[PDB]
Amino acid sequence: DEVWVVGMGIVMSLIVLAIVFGNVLVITAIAKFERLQTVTNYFITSLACADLVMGLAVVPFGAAHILMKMWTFGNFWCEFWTSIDVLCVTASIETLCVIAVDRYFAITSPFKYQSLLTKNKARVIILMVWIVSGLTSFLPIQMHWYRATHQEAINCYAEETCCDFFTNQAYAIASSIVSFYVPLVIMVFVYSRVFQEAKRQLNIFEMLRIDEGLRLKIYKDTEGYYTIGIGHLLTKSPSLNAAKSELDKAIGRNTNGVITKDEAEKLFNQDVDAAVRGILRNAKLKPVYDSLDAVRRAALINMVFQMGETGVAGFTNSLRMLQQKRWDEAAVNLAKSRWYNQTPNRAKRVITTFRTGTWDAYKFCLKEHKALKTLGIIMGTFTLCWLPFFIVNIVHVIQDNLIRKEVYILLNWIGYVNSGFNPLIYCRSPDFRIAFQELLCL
Ligand SMILES: CC(C)CCC[C@@H](C)[C@H]1CC[C@H]2[C@@H]3CC=C4C[C@@H](O)CC[C@]4(C)[C@H]3CC[C@]12C
Ligand SMILES: CC(C)CCC[C@@H](C)[C@H]1CC[C@H]2[C@@H]3CC=C4C[C@@H](O)CC[C@]4(C)[C@H]3CC[C@]12C
Ligand SMILES: CC(C)CCC[C@@H](C)[C@H]1CC[C@H]2[C@@H]3CC=C4C[C@@H](O)CC[C@]4(C)[C@H]3CC[C@]12C
Ligand SMILES: OC[C@H]1O[C@H](O[C@H]2[C@H](O)[C@@H](O)[C@H](O)O[C@@H]2CO)[C@H](O)[C@@H](O)[C@@H]1O
Ligand SMILES: CC(C)NC[C@H](O)COc1cccc2[nH]c3ccccc3c12
Ligand SMILES: *C(=O)CCCCCCCCCCCCCCC
């Protein structure tokens, strides 16, 4: 009975420590490491502050209120505490929604992924998020617009040891729509469009960038030959200066061995052009290529990049099956090669691409697309943690008392606890993971 309290107390204490520790760690990492000082990370910091305030100002007193079974901090702080609670939750979803809109413009911009905002404009957007969240959280609570007019509530308001958030229905509806449902619907809609855009960037360049790798500096390939970019061969000569000469002549400037990503892409589109002409001159590949759709043609080119036309022309049975659209059987045969034996992962992705005729095997391979999934995970987690709570606010406007007080409280704590997850979700990033382990003396 009572020993349960201590044990429940220690648990809630660890929840508070978890929220404060992890969010402190996120703030410190972005504030300390110049590498992590990006526009997105400024909004993340804003998100981390809302969760930090939840962990220090909201969760500790909510815990105490439950364990003591009464409010001991008085009416002033009950109303203040209540205001911070609503503020932090409102600012969180408003920020998440700003991240979605920012990522949408970043990913659709011709200067792709750079936010259209400067660091200073981002601070103003953040400041404006906290002002708007305050205007929508503190005003109604401090102006007493939220309060119900029935006696049980009136008693609780006057009662210094009672801190139950009894509200009128109009507030229950209006506040929950404006603070939560509006920015949630926008976030979800806009960030689903971010994924569609991200998916739509997948193409042969990205495919070979994932499968072969883009190298900005001259390197020796497996045969010892000087190569650059996505396996672009410069010369078979052992003279480096001979490679550099060919590189400069190809790129159109003094490179000194180093090229930009966009120049690697220029060379790659030429190599692709060359591969296709070669395929169309090869009696055994031409019929196959001719019959394939655009995505499977990228598959074939991918293989020609890796093994040359001859190597690929030797897949006589697989080529015939591909020509007939017998995809699974083609895949059975292709999986039985020295190719799949040597580069299984790459082969897996190309064969699967021959199976589906979509780019699905290349989803979330690129660091930037992985980063977009991380953000999507932050958003989805927040949604799943708070949605039940906010559904019950509206359900109680329709028919009150349908769901027990203890269930409603538990759904609120699922919301609270969410303030501890984002720091763990950021361990998906290699940059945060590196940042953290430095900060924790590893
Ligand atoms: C009243 C309660 C909530 C206060 C407890 C706050 C705790 C979580 C604080 C107090 C001291 C803090 C640590 C002090 C120093 C460092 C080293 C730093 O480079 C990374 C963060 C880290 C490891 C801090 C993490 C958060 C920390 C442990
Ligand atoms: C509001 C009360 C009850 C709880 C304590 C509030 C604390 C957690 C808030 C108030 C002001 C906040 C700071 C405001 C500005 C910055 C600059 C930024 O580059 C790193 C975070 C940092 C340094 C914030 C850390 C958290 C902070 C100190
Ligand atoms: C009334 C009390 C309890 C509410 C707490 C409000 C605090 C936490 C709010 C008010 C203004 C907010 C800051 C406004 C602007 C920035 C700039 C950005 O680069 C980091 C976050 C940061 C620094 C915000 C963090 C949270 C913040 C400090
Ligand atoms: O065979 C056509 C392409 O070959 C090179 O790129 C290859 C490279 O030969 C090989 O060592 C490596 O395993 O794969 C890369 C591409 O994945 C050429 O220099 C390309 O320009 C040719 O199109
Ligand atoms: C213990 C209680 C006070 N906790 C409040 C929730 O954590 C967060 O609640 C909200 C956040 C944002 C907007 C909101 N509108 C509401 C209407 C009724 C109840 C809560 C909210 C609410
Ligand atoms: C390496 O970077 C990690 C070493 C940092 C250790 C710092 C020691 C912190 C002491 C914690 C005590 C504060 C507890 C406050 C409770 C209210």
Swiss-Prot record:
<feature type="disulfide bond">
    <location>
        <begin position="78"/>
        <end position="163"/>
    </location>
</feature>
<keyword id="KW-0325">Glycoprotein</keyword>
<dbReference type="GO" id="GO:0031649">
    <property type="term" value="P:heat generation"/>
</dbReference>
<dbReference type="GO" id="GO:0015630">
    <property type="term" value="C:microtubule cytoskeleton"/>
</dbReference>
<keyword id="KW-0333">Golgi apparatus</keyword>
<feature type="binding site">
    <location>
        <position position="85"/>
    </location>
    <ligand>
        <name>(S)-carazolol</name>
    </ligand>
</feature>
<feature type="binding site">
    <location>
        <position position="416"/>
    </location>
    <ligand>
        <name>(S)-timolol</name>
    </ligand>
</feature>
<dbReference type="GO" id="GO:0045171">
    <property type="term" value="C:intercellular bridge"/>
</dbReference>
<feature type="transmembrane region" description="Helical; Name=7">
    <location>
        <begin position="406"/>
        <end position="429"/>
    </location>
</feature>
<feature type="disulfide bond">
    <location>
        <begin position="156"/>
        <end position="162"/>
    </location>
</feature>
<keyword id="KW-0379">Hydroxylation</keyword>
<feature type="modified residue" description="Phosphotyrosine">
    <location>
        <position position="113"/>
    </location>
</feature>
<feature type="binding site">
    <location>
        <position position="85"/>
    </location>
    <ligand>
        <name>(S)-timolol</name>
    </ligand>
</feature>
<dbReference type="GO" id="GO:0071880">
    <property type="term" value="P:adenylate cyclase-activating adrenergic receptor signaling pathway"/>
</dbReference>
<dbReference type="GO" id="GO:0010008">
    <property type="term" value="C:endosome membrane"/>
</dbReference>
<dbReference type="GO" id="GO:0016020">
    <property type="term" value="C:membrane"/>
</dbReference>
<dbReference type="GO" id="GO:0007188">
    <property type="term" value="P:adenylate cyclase-modulating G protein-coupled receptor signaling pathway"/>
</dbReference>
<feature type="transmembrane region" description="Helical; Name=5">
    <location>
        <begin position="169"/>
        <end position="192"/>
    </location>
</feature>
<feature type="lipid moiety-binding region" description="S-palmitoyl cysteine">
    <location>
        <position position="365"/>
    </location>
</feature>
<dbReference type="GO" id="GO:1904504">
    <property type="term" value="P:positive regulation of lipophagy"/>
</dbReference>
<keyword id="KW-0472">Membrane</keyword>
<dbReference type="GO" id="GO:0007166">
    <property type="term" value="P:cell surface receptor signaling pathway"/>
</dbReference>
<dbReference type="GO" id="GO:0043235">
    <property type="term" value="C:receptor complex"/>
</dbReference>
<dbReference type="GO" id="GO:0045453">
    <property type="term" value="P:bone resorption"/>
</dbReference>
<keyword id="KW-0297">G-protein coupled receptor</keyword>
<feature type="lipid moiety-binding region" description="S-palmitoyl cysteine">
    <location>
        <position position="441"/>
    </location>
</feature>
<feature type="transmembrane region" description="Helical; Name=4">
    <location>
        <begin position="123"/>
        <end position="146"/>
    </location>
</feature>
<dbReference type="GO" id="GO:0072686">
    <property type="term" value="C:mitotic spindle"/>
</dbReference>
<comment type="similarity">
    <text>Belongs to the G-protein coupled receptor 1 family. Adrenergic receptor subfamily. ADRB2 sub-subfamily.</text>
</comment>
<dbReference type="GO" id="GO:0061885">
    <property type="term" value="P:positive regulation of mini excitatory postsynaptic potential"/>
</dbReference>
<dbReference type="GO" id="GO:0120162">
    <property type="term" value="P:positive regulation of cold-induced thermogenesis"/>
</dbReference>
<dbReference type="GO" id="GO:0002024">
    <property type="term" value="P:diet induced thermogenesis"/>
</dbReference>
<protein>
    <recommendedName>
        <fullName>Beta-2 adrenergic receptor</fullName>
    </recommendedName>
</protein>
<dbReference type="GO" id="GO:0002028">
    <property type="term" value="P:regulation of sodium ion transport"/>
</dbReference>
<feature type="topological domain" description="Cytoplasmic">
    <location>
        <begin position="102"/>
        <end position="122"/>
    </location>
</feature>
<dbReference type="GO" id="GO:0008179">
    <property type="term" value="F:adenylate cyclase binding"/>
</dbReference>
<keyword id="KW-0807">Transducer</keyword>
<dbReference type="GO" id="GO:0006939">
    <property type="term" value="P:smooth muscle contraction"/>
</dbReference>
<dbReference type="GO" id="GO:0005769">
    <property type="term" value="C:early endosome"/>
</dbReference>
<dbReference type="GO" id="GO:1904646">
    <property type="term" value="P:cellular response to amyloid-beta"/>
</dbReference>
<dbReference type="GO" id="GO:0050873">
    <property type="term" value="P:brown fat cell differentiation"/>
</dbReference>
<feature type="transmembrane region" description="Helical; Name=2">
    <location>
        <begin position="44"/>
        <end position="67"/>
    </location>
</feature>
